[PDB]
Symmetry: D3
Subunit: 323 residues, 6 copies
């Protein structure tokens, strides 16, 4: 294409740990974890009567605890709720350590614009060097119906998470569990020569995951898979993780500490894909040494979109090496 | 999201029985059936030379027969055909009992607008209390390509049906049967350690069903699955029904009387989902008793989109209770 | 619908053979092959340092070799690269035999517009009777995100090919092979009564193929599946071909000569679908004999969209008969 | 531009006479007039209680009177009113003489689509050779805000009329007269060296007329100016007519018989513009004699848009010659 | 049209007085003025170093002074500036008396959305009965280029003001004065028979005013003209006011107390237009007495858009009567 | 607004001289002129049979003559014509001195995209430091109807010229002269107390000029007025120039050498506007010295859009100083 997209800021994002702001002990324990990204939650996991205190707890946690080089985020309240403006104002004013805001229930691009206006103004007032990035949750049918447009809604936007349980609720999917599969979401084969019919299970989230993936990959964002509720089923977690990784997802939520190592292992890039990326970068250097505008590797032209992907993958591999 | 959608009129729609207008005996028998919704057909099931008479038959049937509290609909002829304007004019003028119009082959939002103009004018002339609702058939590749836009095309719009057989024809899918699965729409696994390769069947309608579902659920409509042709295969019907129900579909067509009970059973909401909805409504009442703007259930904020879903589900459960 | 689309020029397109322009011997051998469509490649298969010569080779091959009635195409370089304008100018100026241009990596409708401007001007200068047609490659996440818009981007546009390997690269799908399936892109079933869990493989390209199919079928284009890399696995090729054919795809690439017969066999229309189309055409003639505007077959109205599909299928069947 | 628009059907349209359907005597007298275009009105000039009879009157007038080669139109009731569907159905069914429908108060493109659906179906039923054309009234702020989109809303669309009095009402312009100027819509000059300030009158309809003109001329339609109410002021009529003619308008309404000759005289094309158009057509013939793709006149390339304008102007000049 | 727009909340808005928040004495004096609408300014008239205090001053003024039944507004800082979020949060939290927010420099619809999100959340927190309305300033070329889209950007939106001086700056118009005319923005006539050429002055703001007017009147908003700087020139003020009133503008800014009476006098509706509106309302009552859906006045159908305009004008006339 | 536009490359553009490529003597004489910008024409002024030679002439002129620091442009042939691709390829390949391309008859944004693709590829091949800029001619009703969209069509786009004579032809305006005014484009005043009626001339190009101006000023481009044909009427030229300058236009075409000094004089910025811009830049420096994010001048906040305008004006003033 003649149309070129710039990749978002290239962070390592294999594991995304959710931590309720209402639990300072859990926040403290999380600061020493192996998660790549942590969000401190003001939204779904925090009861209304606890939201004001959780906000205070999070300010203290972001300012006092040692988070290392983790990408630190908050999940703000919904735009449809009165809590949100104080989440953004109080925390962004008080907490230089904050890296990102996770905006829930995003439905249309203007939702993201709204948060960009507010965030920008606070950063202007505080004379901030760091600029906050955004992650959006696609966790409703409305957001899914507008996902491609949402993907281009802010220069801050870096990533989208698939909120599977809230998406199920929004679509009225038959789901009593967070994530997972369903014996009813299956095909019954036509009778074979023996008179037999098999039941082959299908993926209830295939459509959602692929559509969000395409939006992310078209427009330079990280595609992240959401929560998996069955803490007693690491095999099921790992299957779900490997399935979305196979599509191109870059990471997955952890909502129980056991899930952190599982996500980290699955979403580590292969040695081979890192090596290919490194060879692309050396082929770029070669083209510059030769005075040649076109980059070639193993007899193939490597185009600018492909160079940009290679640069992003290397930044991620390099982060792993220094963790 | 800050963007809020109003749910369509909340009807019970588990089973949708198709009845040709060319058969007054079948229409009479259908009036005593257990279908939730009936459409009297002027379109696909009626030969051109029979369309004028079928129109007359339907006027007589809507005016004379006892349909109970069924949602009564007509499937009008295609907008590309000369029959349609007389279908709408003659029946809407003559038949106060009519509840809805099923518009076939919808391709773009302006198709729906056109029917809204005509329907509105006739209702104005007749000084009608009741306002007719619309259901649209997504049964062509054109309609599927525009489904999200179609979903917002009229305040009358309540529901979309996936016309699987006509959709197959439009896409040139290999299909000689109405609905069902296909041994060729399958994956051949890579050889395992024993040298073996399995054939795992896939869902040829997954993309179509999910895209239409997302449009419906984003914009407040009922997602309805279309016909299944093999009357000798209730197990296959039930599998197809349970599979789309698992996604969030609300009902399915019956094109043979045996299919009515099968659809009714599958698309009845679970006791648990009705109970959750009832508890949401009591949590709303609680918030009002306490003077609190935010509704809480089991320690979780229940947002306005979720309240609106609960209200719709209850209206549907209540209808079942009075049938 | 009241909105009507005109079908593209109706070519037989079961097999699409890729031939590198850097290999004149391979080009010569390809001219005697059984492929329906051949593209002479200047892009992915040709190293940068060989592109200028490949352009010359292709001019000689198009002018000198006997291609029969094959649809002859070139795959031009990417719009993001300096080679492209000379590909179009030099070949279109010199080579009346050329039938079509395959535009790679298409991202937005204006990419196609750009090639239409250039192609048109050269045809105006050369006073050409024949008008070149376009095929577009949807082989990036950007193109997939804009596929519906791309489908309406030029009166020359006839077909879209799904570039599976480049699409995988763009989406960061885990893929070291061109096409095929993936043991990780699978679901792990919930434990049954015996404590057992099965692994049911899913289709990593279902979303992509279906979305591109819908765009094509909505807007009158041929949907074509891209390359399959495992030349040692005809069973896998045939499975992949039959799977997309079941959806409605019309043909598939051959990147090794063995794949030509496999594609030709799979994408031949059934005797039954050709017979139905022929009966539609005779029903049209019947309606004209009777003075009737509506066409009827076996008691069903056959609408204009359906007539147009029948006419296209017959043109394709007729081509097979004369090959 | 590479984007090319097809001109509408090229009718002579200098004068457009409005005749109320409630007055059969006036309709009879109008049939012998010198108007180019006549619309028989069911809308603004006909009281509600007279609309049903006016419809009958118009059917009789269109079928019985001798209208010559006039372009014969009806102004249907508003889409927001119950009268309209019977206007279209009854008259189009009964009256082959009808040439066009004037759609009032058009606000959005889908308004035009709606009338195209209904009109098409009736024409299909009646097996009509002639296809009815459309004229739209831009007579509200809504329509003006959407005029460019309305201009591309139907293949039937030929012309737009600026409904000045209804537009004034919609905008709350201070206007007690149909059309004309306003001493208050003026500028007061800054004091000159003598201390004097002049009042220079401005054109209250400049914006409206120019915006509608641009939409028409971009998209191949006739721009027509609406009514002027002061029958005692032919000088004012002629000034208003010459002012919009200077912009490129092609005709103007007559709402009193005296205005017909005034419009005909003003909107006759100059001898010079007809001669230039004729020379363009002979230059086209010259290019064909020489085997040259580019047309040249007096040393200037004459492009396809300019040829199409010349062809339209000649068709209009030829009509005048045969009147 | 079949598309119907709801009118904004119908306030009397002849005069709009600008009062800097940095001047508590001027605010006090303004509370006893005859202005219909007052905005307390935090933006253009307040130096950066005074903005924090002006915010405090305005809170005190809104809470303590007697504003009568005036529509009370604040002009917040620009969205591009850090002051704005504290303007909205502090004042909306503290000041139930506030009626509206005037949003400056609006460029795109999402600017308005952003303020709607923030305003809504604060109102939710405060459990407000009253809902704040919005006025937007169209005072840049960007806003003018997007004015039609801005007009539909919020259910709160009631009015647009043409910020002539800031618009001039944005367009680089030659303007050293706020508003007014320009000897250079004139036409030099062609020589007449005496050899003479006149200079006829044109309206430099005609395009801007008319485009904004059309957006407002299409979408149910009040069109308001902005400031006029020459306090020594009431004749020029009155000319400018009468000129935009003639188009349909509903009011004008006062930036000096002398301008209040001038705006009030010019933008009072005529006795005749109020009488017509009253007769429309009595014709509506008549139609209801007769059981007739169509409203008729003096032999003309009065449509719903026209009824809605009449209702709005009466609400405004009634307000004047009670002032 | 929160939406921010980047200004185009800031060139001095008071005078734009048109020089036919068919006249090498005129090209030589033009190189020593006082024009700011020169376009060497391949389009309107060059007969078809002379276009191939004019292309060669221009290559020689751009490579051999001394153009000083003039902005050097070519007016390429229309996209609808076969000449264009060779204009771009041959000249851009051969002529590093070229600064810009003037694209004629632009109708839609994709026209500009097309030229951006071709231009970019040639620049890539030639390994150019300089990047060519674009100017577009808005000289048709189609382009005027799409002008706002065209304004955002390429990062190369710097300027739009109003092609008055071609625009008149496209709109069918009564115009036998290039530019100028029209006694018929006038208002006839209502009789005064003496029985008199005046004729006040209006501006036939007001709508066009203002709409194009708004598009330019919204999106960071230079608005340039087109040709004036009456070389014997410098007073009329100067009036036309001062009239568009008053709106904010930045320059005007010269099509006769006498017009160069007239344009240069009119479009020189005032001493006062340059001084204000310089004071803005010193206020920016002041804010940086004080550590303050907001810039203040004379008690007013100077926003980023206003800073960017000031920077552009200064770059232009500085250019004048070094000419
Ligand atoms: Cl979730
Ligand atoms: Cl079907
Ligand atoms: Cl590929
Ligand atoms: Cl009117
Ligand atoms: Cl202002
Ligand atoms: Cl011109
Ligand atoms: Mg959630
Ligand atoms: Mg059907
Ligand atoms: Mg490729
Ligand atoms: Mg009217
Ligand atoms: Mg301002
Ligand atoms: Mg021109």
């Amino acid at each position: 294409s003649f149309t070129l997209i710039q990749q978002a800021t290239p962070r390592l994002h294999r594991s995304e740990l959710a931590v309720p702001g209402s639990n300072p002990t859990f926040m403290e324990k999380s600061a020493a974890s192996k998660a790549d990204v942590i969000f401190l939650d003001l939204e779904d996991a925090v009861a209304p009567d606890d939201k004001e205190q959780a906000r205070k707890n999070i300010i203290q946690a972001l300012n006092d605890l040692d988070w290392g080089n983790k990408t630190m985020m908050i999940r703000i309240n919904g735009l449809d709720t009165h809590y949100m403006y104080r989440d953004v104002v109080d925390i962004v004013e008080a907490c230089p350590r904050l890296d990102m805001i996770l905006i829930p229930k995003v439905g249309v691009p203007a939702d993201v614009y709204a948060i960009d206006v507010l965030t920008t103004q606070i950063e202007q007032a505080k004379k901030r060097e760091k600029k906050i990035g955004f992650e959006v949750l696609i966790e409703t049918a409305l957001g899914m119906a507008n996902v491609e447009a949402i993907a281009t809604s802010s220069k801050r936007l870096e990533a989208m998470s698939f909120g599977v349980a809230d998406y199920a609720a929004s679509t009225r999917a038959r789901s009593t569990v967070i994530g997972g599969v369903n014996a009813d979401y299956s095909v019954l084969t036509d009778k074979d020569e023996a008179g037999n019919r098999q039941t082959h299970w299908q993926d209830p989230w295939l459509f959602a995951q692929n559509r969000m993936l395409v939006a992310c990959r078209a427009y330079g964002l990280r595609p992240i898979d959401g929560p998996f509720g069955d803490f007693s089923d690491p095999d099921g977690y790992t299957s779900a993780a490997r399935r979305c990784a196979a599509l191109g997802f870059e990471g997955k939520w952890a909502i129980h500490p056991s899930q952190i190592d599982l996500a980290n292992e699955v979403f580590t890039p292969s040695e081979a894909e890192v090596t290919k990326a490194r060879r692309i970068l050396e082929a770029m250097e070669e083209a510059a040494k030769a005075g040649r505008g076109a980059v070639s590797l193993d007899g193939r032209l490597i185009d600018i979109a492909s160079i940009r992907m290679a640069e992003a993958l290397i930044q991620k591999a390099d982060a792993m090496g220094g963790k």
